[PDB]
């Protein structure tokens, strides 16, 4: 199936909230991050589709990045998400 369908089928809330709490918060968070990796892993090709999954997390939280600065910060956290889940950062992935 397409990455379009694979990513939309998943619940990215734990991933988006995990990132938001760190950037906007400059235990529950290991279970929230653990649930994040569980949701990514449910994708049939989770290593492929990782770019789309990160782009969808960013698209989902964009309205809440009220600042020129918050957007850099969200991006670094996002970019570190794949390694946190024992995947590799994707290769042609523009998060802007």
């Amino acid at each position, epitope marked *: 199936m397409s990455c379009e369908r694979q990513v*939309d089928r*998943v*619940n*990215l809330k734990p991933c988006e909230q995990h990132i938001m709490q760190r950037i906007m918060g400059e235990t529950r968070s290991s279970d929230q991050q653990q*649930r994040c990796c569980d949701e990514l892993n449910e994708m049939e090709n989770t290593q492929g589709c990782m770019c789309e999954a990160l782009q969808q997390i960013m698209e989902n939280q964009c309205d809440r990045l009220q600042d020129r600065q918050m957007v850099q910060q969200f991006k670094r956290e996002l970019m570190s998400l794949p390694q946190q889940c024992n995947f590799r950062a994707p290769q042609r992935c523009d998060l802007d």
Partner: T-cell receptor
Amino acid sequence: SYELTQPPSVSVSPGQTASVTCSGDKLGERYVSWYQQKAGQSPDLVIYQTNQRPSGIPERFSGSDSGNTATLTISGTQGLDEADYYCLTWDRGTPVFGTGTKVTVLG
Amino acid sequence: QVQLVESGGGLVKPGGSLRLSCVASGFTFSDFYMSWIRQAPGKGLEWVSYMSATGGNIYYADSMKGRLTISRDNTKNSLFLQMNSLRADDTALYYCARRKFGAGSAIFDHW
């Protein structure tokens, strides 16, 4: 598969806060969306992303969640807020609407 | 301001076909999932179908499985729903709606 329960009706006096609660298995781990529908009219989105997020919607509308429940809460209900309210969540690509909750404003 | 103008409803004989259409204005239509939702008068909201902006993601509701085709022509800001083998328990209010996010956040933000 995934199921959402809502109280069929909820009554509030003018000025009190009304609470509409939506229940599902570990619903707190998902986003909840809320929709208001007055009779003869199309639904209106009043809260999104598990009720912490509004829109160009009145400030008295707010959302929260806890465990297996999500809650639309209307502070200072005004009678024009009399409507049906529906919660929405998603399950592996399937949109799941709650059964309606009918909010009545007494007085 | 977003606007979704719906047409193609009315009386239809059982077993017949019906093509619903929605013309959008006020946003770049080609950036959004679009959907169809229905509601029998006095009942709750029941989803019917949605599709990606231009994609392989098309979902149909089990209630109508195998009896409807969704499509869109983005050059004309238009969404379509073809309904086949209609039955008496299919009469209802049909809504066109825009979907806004995904992967757990999708919302029907304009109806």
